[PDB]
Amino acid sequence: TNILAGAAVIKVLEAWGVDHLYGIPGGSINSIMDALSAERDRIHYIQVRHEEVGAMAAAADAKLTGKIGVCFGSAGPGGTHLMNGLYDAREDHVPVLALIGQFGTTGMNMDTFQEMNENPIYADVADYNVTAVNAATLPHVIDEAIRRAYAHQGVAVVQIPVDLPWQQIPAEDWYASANSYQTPLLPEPDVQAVTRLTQTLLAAERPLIYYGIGARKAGKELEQLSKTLKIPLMSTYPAKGIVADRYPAYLGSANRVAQKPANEALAQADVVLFVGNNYPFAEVSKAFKNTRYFLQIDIDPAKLGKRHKTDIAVLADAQKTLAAILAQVSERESTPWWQANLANVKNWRAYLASLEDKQEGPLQAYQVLRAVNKIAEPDAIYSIDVGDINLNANRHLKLTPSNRHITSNLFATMGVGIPGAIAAKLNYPERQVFNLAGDGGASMTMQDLATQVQYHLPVINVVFTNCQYGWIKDEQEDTNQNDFIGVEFNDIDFSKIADGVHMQAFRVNKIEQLPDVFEQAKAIAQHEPVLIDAVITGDRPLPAEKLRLDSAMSSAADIEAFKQRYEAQDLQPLSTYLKQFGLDD
Amino acid sequence: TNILAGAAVIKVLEAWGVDHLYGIPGGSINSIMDALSAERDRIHYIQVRHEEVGAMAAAADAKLTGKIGVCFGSAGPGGTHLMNGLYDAREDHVPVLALIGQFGTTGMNMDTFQEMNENPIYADVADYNVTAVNAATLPHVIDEAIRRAYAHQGVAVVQIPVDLPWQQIPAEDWYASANSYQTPLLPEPDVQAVTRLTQTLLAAERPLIYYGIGARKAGKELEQLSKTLKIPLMSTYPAKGIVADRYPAYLGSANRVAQKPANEALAQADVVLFVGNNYPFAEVSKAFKNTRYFLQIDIDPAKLGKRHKTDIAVLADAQKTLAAILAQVSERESTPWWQANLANVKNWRAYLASLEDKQEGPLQAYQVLRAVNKIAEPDAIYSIDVGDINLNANRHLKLTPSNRHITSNLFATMGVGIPGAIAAKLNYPERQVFNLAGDGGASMTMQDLATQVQYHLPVINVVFTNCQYGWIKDEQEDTNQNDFIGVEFNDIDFSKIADGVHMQAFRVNKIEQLPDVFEQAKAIAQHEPVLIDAVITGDRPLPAEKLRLDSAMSSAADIEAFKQRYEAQDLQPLSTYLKQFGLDD
Amino acid sequence: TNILAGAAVIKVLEAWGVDHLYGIPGGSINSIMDALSAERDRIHYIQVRHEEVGAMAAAADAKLTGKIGVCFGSAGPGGTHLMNGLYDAREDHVPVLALIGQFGTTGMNMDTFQEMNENPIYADVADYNVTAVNAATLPHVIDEAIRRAYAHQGVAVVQIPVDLPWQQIPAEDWYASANSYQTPLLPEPDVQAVTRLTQTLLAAERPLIYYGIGARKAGKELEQLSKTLKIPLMSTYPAKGIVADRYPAYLGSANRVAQKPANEALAQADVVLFVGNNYPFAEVSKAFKNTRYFLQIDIDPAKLGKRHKTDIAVLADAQKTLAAILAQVSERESTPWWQANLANVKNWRAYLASLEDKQEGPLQAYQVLRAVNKIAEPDAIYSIDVGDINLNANRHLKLTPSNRHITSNLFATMGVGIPGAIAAKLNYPERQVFNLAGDGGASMTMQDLATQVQYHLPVINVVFTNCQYGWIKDEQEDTNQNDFIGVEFNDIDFSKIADGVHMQAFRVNKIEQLPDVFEQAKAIAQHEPVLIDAVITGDRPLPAEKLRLDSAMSSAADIEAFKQRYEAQDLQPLSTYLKQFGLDD
Ligand SMILES: Cc1cc2nc3c(=O)[nH]c(=O)nc-3n(C[C@H](O)[C@H](O)[C@H](O)COP(=O)(O)OP(=O)(O)OC[C@H]3O[C@@H](n4cnc5c(N)ncnc54)[C@H](O)[C@@H]3O)c2cc1C
Ligand SMILES: Cc1cc2nc3c(=O)[nH]c(=O)nc-3n(C[C@H](O)[C@H](O)[C@H](O)COP(=O)(O)OP(=O)(O)OC[C@H]3O[C@@H](n4cnc5c(N)ncnc54)[C@H](O)[C@@H]3O)c2cc1C
Ligand SMILES: Cc1cc2nc3c(=O)[nH]c(=O)nc-3n(C[C@H](O)[C@H](O)[C@H](O)COP(=O)(O)OP(=O)(O)OC[C@H]3O[C@@H](n4cnc5c(N)ncnc54)[C@H](O)[C@@H]3O)c2cc1C
Ligand SMILES: Cc1ncc(C[n+]2c([C@@](C)(O)C(=O)O)sc(CCOP(=O)(O)OP(=O)(O)O)c2C)c(N)n1
Ligand SMILES: Cc1ncc(C[n+]2c([C@@](C)(O)C(=O)O)sc(CCOP(=O)(O)OP(=O)(O)O)c2C)c(N)n1
Ligand SMILES: Cc1ncc(C[n+]2c([C@@](C)(O)C(=O)O)sc(CCOP(=O)(O)OP(=O)(O)O)c2C)c(N)n1
Ligand SMILES: [Mg+2]
Ligand SMILES: [Mg+2]
Ligand SMILES: [Mg+2]
Ligand code: NA
């Protein structure tokens, strides 16, 4: 006959298949809390220790599963705490619903306690941003919010006056539209455009295929096209793992979270096939200034010819289009361009392996990641924070299509390691989950290590303790006239932090310590979370964007200094391999 | 070697195929003006007399052609005057680019003359909203604005500090992505879903097909499905004309800008096929409260199950899906439901004809519209203002797929009549164009009758002068307890207004005056604009949402009063026709 | 026992002393209309023909009387039409309450007709910006809005769902805080600071007192300080009339809406007393680049040292501080600086008189303004539009403390002439009221000439018809490389426009026609509005910011061209007068 409006709201969430949601209660959201409390069997409330972690974990849920993440915050400070997670969801274009507490409608606009007009707070971040003002339409407003968040791939925010969810509404009127939800059936890729794009790619002397995460369903086709046509592959950083890292012609990514071969090869390429890619450094880094023909495949019209003047842009699904290309091409014999890139990749991997394979001495980030590799299951998920770890994990993690890795790709909020791992373990209780975080990032969300303990989420946390914002210190080295500032700080012993939240932990500062500590951690994480605090050196990782290796481009003194600093004595510039196989710059 | 950034910006507009744009100059936008001035042979600046008319005409350009409309306003009050046209573009989801003047970067944030932070002004209306801060990237920002406005079917606003377009930039770096433009992919109907939909539709006892402008490409399929299956058709008001008005099973539209047979049939229907339709009155009017099964076809996932819980929902193009249904059905015999509706339509149309066919006496809106019909070419375009005219034009205009009509569908801003006709005549100089406007709406944008004169745009302007806001008077009649207020006002003689802007004009107040005046207007408008000021009675048009004709539902006295007031003695309720064919109400 | 919330809201407006308010009704605001209708004996609704005129008139009410202006617009386009008047109120810092219609709370967030989240629309313009959600608190929210608009000298906006004002609330709980209202405290000048200020001012070789409207209560003190100390006076344009224009050491205003002696003297001054002044051109025009000492008196701490570094700054009321200075000084002898400026003023005024005193020939703006002077009562009020008219009225109107004049000072929105005069005549039915407007600005709000007729408001409207946006043509002349664009347009005959709204009118195009036409207008306006359409030449008024008269600074040829164009053969540069009295430039 009647149902509480709050109970109907929870039933809307359940209809859309929301498994878990995050937040911290307050008087202004206690009626939504009351409805969740009656529904503990069907929907799992996760009490976090800071609301930003709830918002970042909701974004991560959607990154991992493609299903909407849900978080909430009480009126005022609860909701404003969500912001770093909500901006992450907006910039990484994933569906998130955020519920915001509000004072009851009888007290709104009275300038009462923690009471303000909350609608303008969320106007910028949100695709949909409304204050509910009626109980009977509240389930519809929640359903609308969800449907829009999915359709528009972003954040829907609903401010809820706390009186509304306690009002009775007719039991028979409300519904959810989850039952209507589907994905579109697309026509086949434009045949004549695909044929023309293929001819241009094949006519090139120095082709590259450069994909981003829009190509996530197309790993098989990418690797087969590469092998068949003898065309090296490079990707955006987040697209690492779509093609296995072990693939001999995967060059890595460009710019700074980057690998030497991709940077060098891109500078030489005459034709680039840019697929499912919205690389934000295209223009500012002049990435394609030497490219003769630029070909694109993207599913979004707003991206067509966005990043560079484009000769042919096909509006289509990446996988369907790459399959259609593969269907019209056949074997090409090895070329000097292919052989030069393969040799360059081999030389680069030997460099990385030399860093990883040190067996004793002062601990560096490189041996830490090798120790991760050694205990990693083939389908492990990595939640990665923001800083040098993106660069180091990008180079050292050995990923395949069976893995997932997530970070804050574009907003790049520090603190995401812990919440992304919480979300990963909640969605995939049977998969191994790592949190790889620098000390600056880990410290911003450290309190929510307690959330892993409280919910028995067996995350393997690895904190990279350099006592620096290393990423920023290296930037200051490059740009700043005056001394380093704000980038070197006091130690925090995260093994003691972990102990304080009742999580087993280790602290290591020597390479020879790694094998046994990581073996213990692997075993602990069969049942409980664990943390390893790795005390690492302040060595700057090799800057792929500032290579000094080529005699024709850099002075002998600069090359000598670069080789010394970066332990890079055995690295050769691409030009050495180009010359070897009969090509010039 | 170099080009002025302003010249490059105009070249971007040209590459995107912008033929004409609107605005009023100011110091804060004179560098864009300077670039326009050099380009006057390739792109055509239309100087309006109020910037809202420029924004409304830009919206109407896009409604009519699907090509982005372009407008501008100077810093401060120029831009703020755009708002009603920009909101019209957002709510009617058509692409519009708005350029806003701003003080030079050397004077921004100094609190100088007409200088303010302009970005927050446009944040709500705009899909994309940026202040340009660099000359070299300015062409890209404009390119970005256009590509987004198209992809997202909405408003892009760029605030341009006046110094930037007078700066030299490299001639060879800037580009437009117009060459890469594509319209969004059209998703295909799932065959099994279409089969299930077809079976539910065929099993219905009282089916209706209820379409909106999303079905504008599917008029043939809608009419053929209706004839073949013996299923009546109804539409949203804006979808009038997709199927010819003369089609005998076209019921009209529901709610208030509505036709009696559509409201009556919808209340009785057991199954609705809701296609390309976002009827905003669905929930508030409880349109579908007694509908057993609800079948939806829409291209936009945000719409699926939005207006009612769906039994079958198809995420696909309207014409593809309707063709798929038509392909799997064959001729059905007549049914009681079908005959009942056909008879109801005949009775209704005879009513409207009786109004139109009066030959002498006090002029009413009905005969004015008959006089429009009599001079209207088969492919005439109608720009319609907001008020009683929407209801009257909806009932009386005899439209076919060959016509176009536009109004402000959802924001419903008064004043659009004049600008929409300006845009119509610019886009279709060889087609007859009407502006049909009430006196309230015509008053709001009356100065831009001067723009039709200045640009020699032969619009036939027809003003319905009731000396009222009739639409609002009728609402106050229905809801207010106290006397009418603000709805009856002083006469404006629009023939004298027209004389003042140097436009030929006539004023009529008797039915017998119409044939000769309209013939003269038809002739004048072969070369120049003309205005007819029609002084009409204050008769209220029949409220299709408040019918008093059925003695099972209304008192004898209310029926009698309704018949007398609305000259509706010969109208019968649908129940009469339902009973004739053996169906109960 | 109970009262309708809408009735209580109107009672709040009455308690606050609101005599009249403006707007246009709509369904979304009909419950406020219903309450107004019952209260028509105590509060007076003015129905305008476009809501921007209602907002601009509300702003002008507050400019004229200091009492909050009140306007409203229906949901969506009604409210958005308010924007230019609301921005005018914000930038001119006057209290205005705007009520915005909204759909009932049962239909909000359902995406129904003309229904949207309206709160973000007003967030930028408004000091206070809330959507009401409860009937019982609605009177308080309106009370809060008014008290804030006053205290903060800005715009308060309340969006009101239409259901709320038709709800019953307890008769005894609501109140207005009008009874508790007070204006902000007037801070007192520090005696030692005033002494230091006085000594710096007296030690100056070339002193100026430069005041704005913050000194509107201190005209007597300004004129007496000037006479006693032999210090010339200059003002912002809006501060014209605070000291009678006939005062022989009044230099006028600087920059462009400016008088030659003010620009010349300011460039030479060593000490400026800057009082009640927020001149927005100070930094951008480098007004004070050669000023040795800068002395400031202002009531607002946000202004102190804003426009230039301060040597002495006094946070105090202008009149109290000026009286304190005057109290500690005595008569000073004449100085070379004083005589030089007095002679410069005489030469300038003889120039303006030579323009005014033409008796026959092609009509220019100058003689029109002389004709206004000749029929103007000593306490006439001038509502001035935006464009050349600001410059011309600034030079030619002969104002005293008995006059008022208003325009849009800082937002500078065109169209204010008509509404400002409507507001003037409502507030001062016994005072003569002029609307002085260019053709561009008069065009924008021309429909509301009907409002002067409807309410029998005997405004003397004077339109300056140059068939140009003259102000902008002159800017393009100064800055643009290519031909003029968008600044010359087609004639509108405003006497025919006037005839169309049933207002008596005249059109003149010769100097000799003025005396009789203006005498007739003076007489007509004893009882009814009247319009004079003055067809004027396209002569550019003398640019006080681009003087070419001094042979030490300009070529002989530029001087000759300047004299001929501006009929300025008898003008001398200030250096002539400086040299006469033994001072060098
Ligand atoms: C500290 C830090 C530093 C970083 N620096 C770098 C760096 O140096 N190098 C680097 O590479 N990255 C770097 N990034 C990541 C970077 O900011 C961008 O997020 C990333 O490069 C963009 O990757 P993308 O194009 O794969 O993803 P997105 O930006 O999400 O783009 C996806 C694209 O694919 C399209 N798409 C989606 N689905 C389909 C489909 N089915 N078919 C076709 N197209 C589809 C979309 O329309 C879009 O254009 C860094 C991140 C961090 C945290
Ligand atoms: C004064 C006034 C009063 C009004 N009152 C009424 C009234 O009483 N009755 C009335 O009917 N209207 C009325 N309106 C118009 C009304 O507000 C709505 O705008 C209208 O009913 C919605 O029409 P629609 O669904 O055709 O258009 P839209 O709202 O534009 O929706 C079109 C739909 O089609 C979908 N679509 C687009 N392309 C495709 C495709 N290729 N295939 C499938 N789907 C597609 C879109 O996703 C969208 O859902 C009034 C207007 C005015 C000015
Ligand atoms: C088309 C056009 C062009 C214009 N160009 C010019 C131009 O060339 N030249 C020009 O002069 N103007 C021009 N303006 C007007 C200009 O934009 C500014 O509005 C004006 O110069 C500022 O005047 P003001 O300082 O008197 O007023 P405001 O900006 O309102 O400032 C008043 C000051 O007085 C202070 N105050 C208030 N009360 C007191 C008190 N009791 N005691 C002490 N201080 C107090 C306030 O805090 C404030 O600082 C133009 C206007 C238009 C429409
Ligand atoms: C919340 C927050 N605060 C600051 C930053 C800036 N910021 C970064 C970037 C990528 O945005 C950047 O500026 O280049 S990276 C970074 C340092 C990360 O320090 P960590 O100790 O976590 O990582 P290491 O680099 O391994 O030392 C900071 C502070 C950020 N990204 N997020
Ligand atoms: C710019 C503006 N201002 C006010 C309105 C409100 N409004 C209308 C609706 C549909 O929005 C409504 O409220 O129902 S309809 C309307 C009256 C239009 O009066 P007209 O004289 O033009 O038409 P008639 O109804 O033929 O008299 C007004 C003022 C509006 N739509 N746009
Ligand atoms: C609503 C609106 N639109 C445009 C403008 C720009 N604008 C002006 C300024 C002061 O803002 C300026 O840019 O310098 S002045 C101006 C011209 C006014 O032309 P008129 O015909 O009314 O006056 P004359 O100068 O006498 O011809 C315009 C269009 C403006 N102020 N307000
Ligand atoms: Mg660190
Ligand atoms: Mg009317
Ligand atoms: Mg003019
Ligand atoms: Na107007």
Side-chain angles (χ1 to χ4, degrees), chain C residues 293-314:
Chain C
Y293 300 121
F294 190 85
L295 313 168
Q296 192 180 2
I297 303 164
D298 204 287
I299 202 166
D300 178 5
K303 302 292 194 298
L304 296 181
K306 178 176 175 40
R307 298 299 182 174
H308 202 254
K309 190 166 34 203
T310 235
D311 295 278
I312 288 129
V314 173

Side-chain angles (χ1 to χ4, degrees), chain A residues 386-388 412-414 438-441 444 466 468-472 475:
Chain A
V386 171
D388 280 349
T413 180
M414 288 163 71
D439 52 359
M444 286 179 179
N466 51 12
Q468 292 173 162
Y469 296 125
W471 199 247
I472 310 312
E475 292 167 357

Side-chain angles (χ1 to χ4, degrees), chain A residues 147 175 179-180 182 185 302 305, chain B residues 147 175 188 302 305-306 310 313:
Chain A
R147 189 161 15 76
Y175 70 97
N179 69 294
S180 318
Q182 55 206 269
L185 279 22
Chain B
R147 176 157 26 72
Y175 74 99
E188 319 260 3
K306 178 176 175 40
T310 235

Side-chain angles (χ1 to χ4, degrees), chain B residues 183-356:
Chain B
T183 60
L185 303 174
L186 297 173
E188 319 260 3
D190 180 64
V191 298
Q192 303 157 100
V194 176
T195 301
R196 295 186 323 256
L197 187 158
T198 302
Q199 288 312 299
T200 304
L201 186 64
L202 291 183
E205 300 288 355
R206 296 170 310 281
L208 290 169
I209 296 157
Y210 188 6
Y211 56 93
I213 63 166
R216 76 226 235 163
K217 288 181 29 170
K220 208 230 302 188
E221 293 81 358
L222 289 160
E223 190 174 335
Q224 194 58 65
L225 274 166
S226 181
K227 287 172 163 169
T228 295
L229 295 181
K230 312 293 178 288
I231 300 171
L233 293 181
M234 59 179 294
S235 81
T236 62
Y237 153 54
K240 177 189 171 70
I242 292 168
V243 176
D245 285 306
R246 57 160 182 274
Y247 178 55
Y250 180 67
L251 306 178
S253 56
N255 190 228
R256 188 175 175 202
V257 179
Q259 309 208 46
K260 163 181 181 295
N263 270 348
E264 293 182 301
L266 186 58
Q268 300 300 124
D270 67 336
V271 174
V272 178
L273 179 57
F274 192 69
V275 47
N277 194 329
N278 196 36
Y279 184 55
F281 299 99
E283 302 94 337
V284 299
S285 78
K286 303 173 199 283
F288 309 115
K289 69 171 334 291
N290 293 311
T291 309
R292 191 179 178 202
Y293 300 121
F294 190 85
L295 313 168
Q296 192 180 2
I297 303 164
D298 204 287
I299 202 166
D300 178 5
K303 302 292 194 298
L304 296 181
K306 178 176 175 40
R307 298 299 182 174
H308 202 254
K309 190 166 34 203
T310 235
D311 295 278
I312 288 129
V314 173
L315 186 62
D317 179 61
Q319 173 177 41
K320 293 181 168 184
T321 307
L322 290 165
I325 301 168
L326 188 60
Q328 70 191 278
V329 299
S330 59
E331 176 83 6
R332 285 215 297 196
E333 180 167 282
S334 162
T335 66
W337 175 241
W338 170 250
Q339 294 302 332
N341 282 283
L342 290 178
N344 200 30
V345 174
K346 293 184 54 175
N347 175 250
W348 172 244
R349 296 189 182 166
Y351 171 72
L352 300 173
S354 75
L355 299 179
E356 294 169 5

Side-chain angles (χ1 to χ4, degrees), chain C residues 468-483:
Chain C
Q468 305 172 154
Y469 293 125
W471 197 251
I472 312 305
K473 180 173 176 290
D474 298 337
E475 297 170 353
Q476 293 188 353
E477 177 183 341
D478 299 348
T479 64
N480 287 24
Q481 299 307 310
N482 303 307
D483 293 349

Side-chain angles (χ1 to χ4, degrees), chain B residues 24-28 51 74-75 77-79 81 113-114, chain C residues 84 256 385-389 392 411-415 437-442 444 464 466 468-472 475 489 536:
Chain B
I24 295 185
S28 64
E51 301 90 345
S74 58
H81 263 174
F113 181 72
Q114 287 190 309
Chain C
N84 278 54
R256 188 175 175 202
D385 217 282
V386 171
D388 281 354
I389 191 55
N392 288 324
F411 195 55
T413 180
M414 286 163 73
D439 51 2
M444 292 182 173
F464 292 75
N466 51 11
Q468 305 172 154
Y469 293 125
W471 197 251
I472 312 305
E475 297 170 353
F489 48 69
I536 56 162

